[model samples]
Target: VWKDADTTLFCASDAKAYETEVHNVWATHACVPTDPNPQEIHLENVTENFNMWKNNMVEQMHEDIISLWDQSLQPCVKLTGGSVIKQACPKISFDPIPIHYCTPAGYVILKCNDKNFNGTGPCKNVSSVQCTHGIKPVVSTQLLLNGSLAEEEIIIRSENLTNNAKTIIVHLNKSVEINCTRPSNDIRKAYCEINGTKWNKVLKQVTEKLKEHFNNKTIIFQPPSGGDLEITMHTFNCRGEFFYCNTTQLFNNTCIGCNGTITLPCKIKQIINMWQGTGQAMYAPPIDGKINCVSNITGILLTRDGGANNTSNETFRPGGGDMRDNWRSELYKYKVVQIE
Candidate 1:
């Protein structure tokens, strides 16, 4: 781990890390000081040894200028009313191949009429493989579940997935300001918001349903005093995007639970996979203790953790069958336990 007042970059190899100003990281050519595009080899040599070319000067690890792959995958999520398409389905299984300087052959797409191409190959097996070396629409951001590119059964796509499509629409999860504080302690105020009264609109729908259970009681998320299994995990994508919220909006939180502490009914019954319940994000799940049911009671039925796009949703196990509404009905009643 390397740290400073403004930076905390972690890496496996602790090669005496330190923080300093590094510039020109976001362009096609920023490193090889003398030349942005070095005349190392011919363009013809690229197609034959594409992957090798991208690795050119990569091993030296001392180049002043570098040529890196430029890709803008899934861009945005939770769009504004001005948007046209409602949602985009992108499967980790059939996502695009990382286009690189290696060569045109790096991304080979075949035109075989199959319902679905085998997941293993990046359009490799088919002899009819066609090369797509052109411009494609890049999304606003290329984020995955909590830093992942594998969200199976959660989401799919097309010809020349490398760089063929002309238009790109990034559906970023965007920023959510969840004010889990003060007035929010009250049941009526449980409706927190990303920016405004978020849970309000949805909480209202379950108001009557909740009255049946805890009408006489009020709800409160006593800060981590001791035994509280419920943990509220939140994520904000596009931290590095242009003109968007950056490192300043930093927050770290946690929850804990035990055997003889105040717990919810869902906690008592057989384990319920809330991770897949609300279709939350990947990082939103409990990291310690046990809060699957606790989060559920508190209307935190989540499994996905937003990372710029719909990729997070794809990470969670889909809410099974009637469990969707069954769990939603549970959200009607506040299910947090008093901190012990």
Candidate 2:
């Protein structure tokens, strides 16, 4: 033991004694003197100390922030680089092969003949396969449905009048106009003429004869006699050799009976098949000695008389059933032209 001013120091056996003596020991060690300036001392001890601790804590947080950023950005970079991690590989899967199915665009045809598919295996079945690529986008514009011409007018004129005295020109302007607008492209330019001199009398006589012959049901024209006369008619429904007439020879009164006639068979006009339900029916006669309804026509159905050579004739029978009012009824409405 060693004795000092106000303290007693002790030492282990043979160890040197620790320094414990001081003049102002309490003043030097009493809570560091509680700061000479109370405010300054408090600020330095409390505020400055807390600030240092906060700075240290913020520095530590930087490490964790950097780690989080790396974790979030690394995955995106690997995906963009197409790098596959071993642990992320997808599991393999197994499935049965799909059976082939028929589609609307596909086609299948079975032909029994040897020409197609070599005539093998159950009537030589041939099938085609197709797939829908994608939906086709289309833009279209349509005309107004109810906007169309309802009626048309036409005019026919004749030149080279031979004898204005004995010949009479009976102009069927209205009838010719009607024929001009006929829907048939085959016969739309037909006409007839009479001498100007005998126009009134011959027209009256011809009109009566035509009325009687045609049974007066909308007889378009009448036959004329005496003097040179010509007849021409346009047609939209006839299918045969186009005919023309002139009054030149008959006007001289030298020819006994110079007359001509034109005839056309009435039939369904036109047939158009659109979609499943929308369709059209038409009756059209040949303008150039051709037959209509070749599938059902057997022979010419014309009466061979009056020096008129019945060159060709045809008939048609539409409709599948035995309905009598089928296309055959068109025969009764045949247009017949006779000359004398």
Candidate 3:
């Protein structure tokens, strides 16, 4: 603030004074109820202060800042004992926001009108502004799996995405790693999920694989990892088995996968009443064995209960304790794989 010794300037050194104030100062000095003539150069110092401040604030302020500032200041007509305060100029009004009317895919845009409260104003060429927010930054991103694009289970921290890049290409492989400019928030320790499968190891090599793919002479691409259910049961309670993958709820038994029949082969891992349990019921896949899967499958539950159950499709783990009869050292053995 540039404060004068006699009359507090409340003005910036390099910037001009507010225009209204400039006129008022002229009046105060000339001692008029209103200026006979509002001369522009009369307050050249005020103009200098205003111009300097405006330039510095434009980049950081919202487009409506100048209008708001100008509107808020009122110039009154005052006599020795009485003054007249006039109504705000330009009929200022406020409209609630986040008002969007769906635009048809095929639409006719119109020529802008003056009523556009925020048309071609300060937000013109900037990234985002309340009025022009309908527009978006032109950027494209795709997640490639085995050199192919993937679409699901992607949790991107939008903040890190919007500010950084115009593109992000990825590869699908357990030994392949991605070279992201920003730190990655991987789900599987050093991996991530695509169609619910974990991969993305050897980030450096994986990234090169993708970059290398673009440099290839031939294009033979497909989703690197096929799909299936991954039943990670932490408890043997019945509720742990139900799955509602798509509308029709079913026990995690008999998931449909791989054109060729995929099977869940189990071994007779003996279970003592207290052999694996110390009376307090613990959690584990029922009957233990090596589940040799020949194809990419969404399952590997080699236990007797072997599946999901319940009505409203909720995962219902009914009643606790091993009744010995229901809890057996057998696998339903390869959970019922009934598929449509």
Q: Best to worst by lDDT, what's the order?
A: 2, 1, 3
Point out the worst 10-residue segment of candidate 3 by lDDT.
329-338
Instruction: Please list the residue runs of candidate 1 whose C-alpha ends up more than 4 Å from where it truly belongs after superposition.
Output: 1-27, 30-115, 121-340
lDDT of 2: 0.20
- Per residue, candidate 3 scores C-alpha lDDT tens digits across 180-215 of 111123111111112211221222233343334234
Give per-candidate clash totals: 23, 42, 29
Per-residue alpha-carbon lDDT of candidate 1 for residues 1-340, written as tens digits (9 for 90 to 100) = 1111111111111111232111222222321222223222112211110111122112221121111111121222323233432233232111111111111222222221212221212222122222212111121111112211112211121112223221111111122223221121112111112322332332333232222323323222212122112222121111111111111111111111211222111111111112212321111111222111101112222122224142211111111121222211111111111111
lDDT against the true structure, each candidate: 0.19, 0.20, 0.19
Candidate 2 Cα errors over 4 Å, as ranges: 1-102, 105-122, 125-264, 268-340
Indicate the residue-level lDDT of 157 in model 1. Answer: 18
Error of 3 at 31 (Å): 66
The regions of model 3 sitting more than 4 angstroms off are: 1-259, 264-281, 284-340
Rank all candidate structures by their TM-score, best first, as comma-separated numbers.
1, 3, 2
After the best TM-score superposition of candidate 2, give how far the Cα of residue 306 lies from its true spot, in angstroms: 41
